[PDB]
Design a protein around this ligand. Structure first.
Ligand SMILES: Nc1nc2c(ncn2[C@@H]2O[C@H](COP(=O)(O)OP(=O)(O)OP(O)(O)=S)[C@@H](O)[C@H]2O)c(=O)[nH]1
Ligand SMILES: [Mg+2]
Lengths: 166, 93
């Protein structure tokens, strides 16, 4: 049975953990517990093909490249996550992508741009901006909320689809 | 609980310099969070600073708004993950 190694990266507090737990446990974690490192494994069926999701939920804004380089080398696919009420997290995406490209030595790494917390009223990053960014990278953009489950399955399963179509 | 004596030591209308006291044990990093007092789940911003720091600068605040500022500490011990309760203050109105 085929295994997919997915890594969820992005700045602090954007919802990387909430997204992953929502996918794995079908529950919203409303408590903020800054992550060190969390690994999850779950058997699912995607587009009729059965597979194992091996998901690494990383610490936001990792300070040490020796840590970061490990999971960027082993990951087959990357959810690059920002929060739509956090402009900084949006701009940070560029660095995460650059880092991944550098460790992989490639421009085409399976990746999905994820804008989380779409349930929030007061938004500071517009869809247009994120659509444009995604476009320029040549990857999908998925608006999500880990609170409501909007787009959660879409994000991860699309990432799997991108690895399959590499 | 575990970083103590969180305080604002310098302010501008858009920015804060905060300071705290490190605990006895080694810390991997601190996460600082800020949002408006009484914000709903997820309505905050967050960044990280190394465990060797005991201050941080928060930017892009709205002038004259009341904020809740929270500092979390994380690391590893032989007891396992070090996950102490955070400490918070409110500042500005
Ligand atoms: N309203 C709302 N709140 C959310 C959403 N996703 C996460 N949150 C909240 O935001 C906070 C941060 O979530 P979390 O998933 O821990 O961030 P993270 O990216 O894992 O953080 P880190 O581990 O890198 S420091 C939590 O309080 C969580 O409940 C969302 O879609 N909507
Ligand atoms: Mg987390």
């Amino acid at each position: 049975m085929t295994e997919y190694k997915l890594v969820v990266v992005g700045a602090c507090g954007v919802g990387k953990s909430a997204l992953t737990i929502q996918l794995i446990q079908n529950h919203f974690v409303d408590e903020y517990d800054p992550t060190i490192e969390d690994s999850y494994r779950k058997q699912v069926v995607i587009d009729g093909e059965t597979c194992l999701l091996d998901i690494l939920d990383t610490a936001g804004q990792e300070e040490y490249s020796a840590m970061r380089d490990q999971y960027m080398r082993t990951g087959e696919g990357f959810l690059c996550v920002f929060a739509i009420n956090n402009t900084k997290s949006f701009e940070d995406i560029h660095q995460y992508r650059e880092q991944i490209k550098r460790v992989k030595d490639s421009d085409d790494v399976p990746m999905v741009l994820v804008g989380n917390k779409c349930d929030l009223a007061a938004r500071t990053v517009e869809s247009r901006q994120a659509q444009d960014l995604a476009r320029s990278y040549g990857i999908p953009y998925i608006e999500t909320s880990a609170k409501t489950r909007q787009g959660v399955e879409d994000a991860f399963y699309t990432l799997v689809r991108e690895i399959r179509q590499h | 609980s575990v970083p103590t004596k969180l305080e604002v030591v310098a302010a501008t209308p858009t920015s804060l310099l905060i300071s705290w006291d490190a605990p006895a044990v080694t810390v991997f990093f601190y996460v600082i969070t800020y949002g408006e007092t009484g914000h709903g789940v997820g309505a905050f911003q967050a960044f990280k600073v190394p465990g060797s720091k005991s201050t941080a600068t928060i930017s892009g605040l709205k002038p004259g708004v009341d904020y809740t500022i929270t500092v979390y500490a994380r690391g590893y011990s032989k007891q396992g993950p070090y996950k102490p309760s955070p400490i918070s203050i409110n500042y500005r109105t």
